[PDB]
From a paper:
Unlike other PLs, Smlt1473 present in the clinically relevant Stenotrophomonas maltophilia strain K279a demonstrates a wide range of pH-dependent substrate specificities toward multiple, diverse polysaccharides: hyaluronic acid (pH 5.0), poly-β-D-glucuronic (celluronic) acid (pH 7.0), poly-β-D-mannuronic acid, and poly-α-L-guluronate (pH 9.0). To decode the pH-driven multiple substrate specificities and selectivity in this single enzyme, we present the X-ray structures of Smlt1473 determined at multiple pH values in apo and mannuronate-bound states as well as the tetra-hyaluronate-docked structure. We have built and refined the structures from residues A22-L330; electron density for other residues outside this range was either weak or absent. The structure is composed of 13 α-helical segments (α-1 to α-13) connected by 14 loops (L-1 to L-14) and two β-strands (β-1 and β-2) (Fig. 2, B and C (i and ii)).
Residue numbers in the entry: 22 to 329
Write the structure that this text describes.
Amino acid sequence: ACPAPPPGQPDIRAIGYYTDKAGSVIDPALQQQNKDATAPLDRYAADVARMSDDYLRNGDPAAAQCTLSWLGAWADDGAMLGQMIRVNNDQSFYMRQWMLDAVAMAYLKVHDQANPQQRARIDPWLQKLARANLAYWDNPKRRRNNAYYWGGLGVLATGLATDDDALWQAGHAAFQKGIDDIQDDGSLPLEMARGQRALHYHDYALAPLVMMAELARLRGQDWYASRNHAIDRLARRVIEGSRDPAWFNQHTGAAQLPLQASGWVEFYRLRSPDGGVFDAAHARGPFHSPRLGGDLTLMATHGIVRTP
């Protein structure tokens, strides 16, 4: 059944790979360096997403218990509670938010199988990771773009899974900053500044906002309603952009790398079907994203959590 977890390194040394002020032009050499430096961390997230996927699929306690064993090792190791090393930007910080997103969701998914010793071992670790990612945004010179929405998702999943009301509320605030920034356009000013990756970054911003709204929904809260379903304008801007990038081309003045919408469609489809405009993207599934919690198709259809 359960293979030996990989080691849990305390430091992250990730590398930024955009050459230009707009962060739209990839230096292939730096991109390869960042891929190689983050491979073990990505493998851990992919694995913990998948083993928690398996437990959601057929309620097999072996799947959950292996997930819990893997999380408990990195908890015991104090994985990613060391130094976030800056090479040429904050890539190490972003990577810890994506990692917390992956590990916190996996934990939530298998939480109902967690015994008191497992809870007691994992919760403190997730709470420390969440509090450290929050420390990163106590600085007002750090512009709250999609990175803050990715930060929020892990903080929030942590708040829900470990029942910490303060982290839950900090998560909500991150969500609320995103919804507040949505123009009547459906655009996000800080994402419109990312040249040929504006459409990519509208998709990439919307995705953690949708997953955060799905976590609120597990507590019977409707955050999608906020500012008259402002999120719907962004959902509709992105999916239009995937069939035809004229609007973003005109409004960024920059030819848009084509986009296929990511697995936020699988949830949002069910909440606001908006004439079926999300079904073409739905057809291309299933959608796997460890940093969104894993198999989004599976979670939207049967639930993020097996028992409320």
